[PDB]
Design a protein around this nucleic acid. Structure first.
Ligand SMILES: [Mg+2]
Ligand SMILES: [Mg+2]
Ligand SMILES: [Mg+2]
Ligand SMILES: [Mg+2]
Ligand SMILES: [Mg+2]
Ligand SMILES: [Mg+2]
Ligand SMILES: [Mg+2]
Ligand SMILES: [Mg+2]
Ligand SMILES: [Mg+2]
Ligand SMILES: [Mg+2]
Ligand SMILES: [Mg+2]
Ligand SMILES: [Mg+2]
Ligand SMILES: [Mg+2]
Ligand SMILES: [Mg+2]
Ligand SMILES: [Mg+2]
Ligand SMILES: [Mg+2]
Ligand SMILES: [Mg+2]
Ligand SMILES: [Mg+2]
Ligand SMILES: [Mg+2]
Ligand SMILES: [Mg+2]
Ligand SMILES: [Mg+2]
Ligand SMILES: [Mg+2]
Ligand SMILES: [Mg+2]
Ligand SMILES: [Mg+2]
Ligand SMILES: [Mg+2]
Ligand SMILES: [Mg+2]
Ligand SMILES: [Mg+2]
Ligand SMILES: [Mg+2]
Ligand SMILES: [Mg+2]
Ligand SMILES: [Mg+2]
Ligand SMILES: [Mg+2]
Ligand SMILES: [Mg+2]
Ligand SMILES: [Mg+2]
Ligand SMILES: [Mg+2]
Ligand SMILES: [Mg+2]
Ligand SMILES: [Mg+2]
Ligand SMILES: [Mg+2]
Ligand SMILES: [Mg+2]
Ligand SMILES: [Mg+2]
Ligand SMILES: [Mg+2]
Lengths: 93, 122, 85, 95
RNA sequence: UUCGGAGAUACUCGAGUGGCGAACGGGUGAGUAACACGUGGGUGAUCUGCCCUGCACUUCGGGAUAAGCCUGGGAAACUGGGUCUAAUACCGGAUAGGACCACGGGAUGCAUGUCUUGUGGUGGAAAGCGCUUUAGCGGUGUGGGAUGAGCCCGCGGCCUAUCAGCUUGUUGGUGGGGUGACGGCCUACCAAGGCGACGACGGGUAGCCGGCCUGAGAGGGUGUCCGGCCACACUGGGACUGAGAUACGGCCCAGACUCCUACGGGAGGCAGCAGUGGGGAAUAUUGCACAAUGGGCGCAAGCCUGAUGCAGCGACGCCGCGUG
RNA sequence: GCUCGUAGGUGGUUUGUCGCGUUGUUCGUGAAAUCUCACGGCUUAACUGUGAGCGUGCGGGCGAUACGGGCAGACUAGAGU
């Protein structure tokens, strides 16, 4: 299946992460089909961004994200606006 | 029965594939080598790059003969080929494995190692 | 082998190969029978055996013992075979 | 209960074949034609223009072709071991 | 209730049947001068499980079998015999267009051709599992996407002519077979063609690449970390299941090597993570965690992950800072 | 040693056309990482991240024809009779 997974591209003491779309049967630091965001969990709130208009495209066609990405997807609000929840708005700070 | 100027194929992996009986040991003027008789032989041809080289004078024990041999129970043993295995002065084979069937007469002549590593003993 | 699943997996593989063998023996004997029918040009038994031949061939395709592409290839093959009988 | 039972195919532009032009040298192999292509390309280090040719095979649904025959061709699915081309139109026939 | 056994009804669950995964993941670079690799295209000549979406269906049944139990043989490895039981395992059905054939329309071309349909005659699918009483997991036929893949081709990329003739399934065609698919991929027949001095065929060497080193650049050297592609998995040959196979920790055979045997017979493949021996001038811990991410499976919690995160050792290299 | 000559390389003047080379522009590709520029943070650095170049090449479309090349011609100055 096409996955929206969290790919690790960081150092020993910093786990920077960069979100794309890739096939499941693929290693982390492989070829990502298209880059759609980044996630740095070192600042106080976070450092979060998703493209928010190709993420809808991938979720509509069937790119299922993983379990750490699903939380972040509710956070950016794309999950709610894709599933028709009343909390469609993004809730990041 | 194997006698001098008889060629036997070698039933081991020392490298020799054919040896020429020089003497049949076991007495003055002894003529024939049956199953389990010890022979001094010269290696008439060997595998290229083998351990045992052409023209080597070696000691060998006959382990299969095409002449039928009587067992004491009135049975007979016969093979399609004359074959010997090169042995060390303590009757252990110079090679590390034996190819082909082996006559049981080597058991009571104390070729026990050869019996052990023979594919199957008749 | 070693893996607890691998022994079970082989035990399933033998089941698969045998139950597959029943099927491909059936369809081979049946295509040979159809060739017997067509070579003779009876055109009566050859006309009425298709109801069995494509029946079991499509059964094979549904159960997946073979694949629908070659299934279509064979059925077109004998269809055009009788089309000149 | 409401859908169209056939989602239409997404409109994708038709990928085209590649066409080229060449003569013919040999003809007596039974609906096969041999076109000797031409190409010139910049020499990688000395910078000259090198003239390099080809000898390739194209189809003939009708086995009529002389020697010469400036003709054009485009690719196909392989019809033999080394068949990759098809004759499309014959111009300025062998004179 | 014996005082240390019975009671499956019962959460819980050993052994057992089935599904998915195991083709991803990791290693090595032996082989390979090749569409193997880099770059760009063609597939009107193709496949693609689980993922998303659109539409109908879940309709009747049968018969075995594991496991279990009683036993037999063998040293074991393992295996024979007899009862007994299921399922989303297997088999039989009814209906169902994306099978086919034939005859036609309607659109488009790039020729074999492509799609949407109609008529007629043939055909093929499934299934159930749980519930605190709006806990929920399924399945099947298909249209289209997404992804992965297969194949084909232009260009590019070592030495050598003290290698000049190479090719017979070779070159093409027809009818077939076979493939997922075109294709001498294979086969019967027919003709005698194809490649080559722009280097065929051969010999030697070699994994390739983005890159790395150097250089002002062009070039020269090189392909180590990372990443992409390929090939291989003791050596050599082959199939199976499955969507998907160089099937490293699958199977079959042959060969070489180590071990057990009661001598009849069997087991093994670290170029996975370690680590050992051996060669060398020379390169390391038989550590921890699944905390994170990626992955496998399950409604889920959860279990697996030597991938991964790390950690130890080597000044092995770069950078930084002290020894006032 | 010299010459002739095969493949190849190269080729006078002019007209028209094609636009293959050449050349212009755009689109797509040229993954990520690497290298360069600018910032940002690990105490600075090494290292990392982000944005902009690189990705020289290739494919499609739309332009051009000065030069080279193909074609259809012409001239006599080269060449030959
Ligand atoms: Mg299982
Ligand atoms: Mg039969
Ligand atoms: Mg066919
Ligand atoms: Mg043809
Ligand atoms: Mg249990
Ligand atoms: Mg495996
Ligand atoms: Mg693998
Ligand atoms: Mg190595
Ligand atoms: Mg029953
Ligand atoms: Mg049924
Ligand atoms: Mg029906
Ligand atoms: Mg299930
Ligand atoms: Mg033939
Ligand atoms: Mg043919
Ligand atoms: Mg055919
Ligand atoms: Mg090598
Ligand atoms: Mg210089
Ligand atoms: Mg590499
Ligand atoms: Mg290495
Ligand atoms: Mg080894
Ligand atoms: Mg299969
Ligand atoms: Mg293993
Ligand atoms: Mg290791
Ligand atoms: Mg040493
Ligand atoms: Mg984990
Ligand atoms: Mg996870
Ligand atoms: Mg480390
Ligand atoms: Mg240090
Ligand atoms: Mg040192
Ligand atoms: Mg320093
Ligand atoms: Mg001259
Ligand atoms: Mg000359
Ligand atoms: Mg000339
Ligand atoms: Mg010229
Ligand atoms: Mg000129
Ligand atoms: Mg700063
Ligand atoms: Mg900085
Ligand atoms: Mg950088
Ligand atoms: Mg780049
Ligand atoms: Mg003159």
């Amino acid at each position: 299946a096409v996955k929206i997974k969290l790919t690790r591209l960081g150092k020993i003491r910093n786990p920077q992460y960069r979100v794309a779309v890739a096939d499941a049967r693929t290693r982390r630091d492989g070829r990502a089909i298209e880059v759609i965001g980044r996630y740095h969990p070192k600042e106080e709130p976070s450092l979060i961004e998703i493209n928010s208009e190709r993420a809808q495209y991938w979720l509509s066609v069937g790119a299922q994200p993983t379990e750490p990405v699903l939380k972040l997807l509710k956070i950016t609000g794309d999950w709610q606006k894709f599933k028709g929840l009343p909390g469609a708005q993004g809730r990041l700070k | 029965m194997i006698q001098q100027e008889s060629r036997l194929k070698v039933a081991d992996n020392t490298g020799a594939k054919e040896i020429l009986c020089i003497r049949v040991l076991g007495g003055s003027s002894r003529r024939y080598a049956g199953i389990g008789d010890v022979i001094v032989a010269t290696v008439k041809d060997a595998i290229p790059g083998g351990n045992v080289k052409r023209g080597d004078v070696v000691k060998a024990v006959v382990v299969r003969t095409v002449k039928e041999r009587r067992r004491p129970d009135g049975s007979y043993i016969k093979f399609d080929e004359n074959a010997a295995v090169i042995i060390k002065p303590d009757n252990d084979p110079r090679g590390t494995r034996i190819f082909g069937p082996v006559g049981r007469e080597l058991r009571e002549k104390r070729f026990m190692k050869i019996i052990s590593l023979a594919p199957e003993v008749l | 082998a070693n893996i607890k699943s691998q022994q079970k997996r082989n035990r399933t593989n033998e089941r698969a190969r045998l139950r597959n063998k029943a099927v491909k023996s059936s369809l081979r004997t049946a295509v040979r029978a159809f060739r017997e029918a067509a070579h003779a040009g009876d055109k009566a038994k050859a006309a009425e055996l298709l109801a069995s031949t494509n029946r079991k061939l499509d059964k094979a395709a549904s159960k997946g013992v073979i694949h629908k592409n070659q299934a279509a290839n064979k059925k077109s093959a004998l269809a055009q075979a009788l089309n000149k009988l | 209960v409401k859908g169209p039972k056939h989602t239409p195919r997404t409109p994708k532009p038709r990928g085209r074949r590649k066409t080229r032009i060449g003569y013919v040298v040999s003809d007596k192999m039974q609906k096969t034609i041999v076109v000797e292509l031409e190409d010139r390309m910049r020499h990688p280090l000395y910078g000259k223009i090198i003239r390099t040719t080809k000898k390739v095979k194209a189809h003939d649904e009708d086995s009529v072709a002389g020697i010469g025959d400036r003709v054009s061709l485009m690719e196909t699915r392989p019809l033999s071991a080394t068949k990759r081309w098809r004759l499309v139109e014959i111009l300025e026939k062998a004179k």
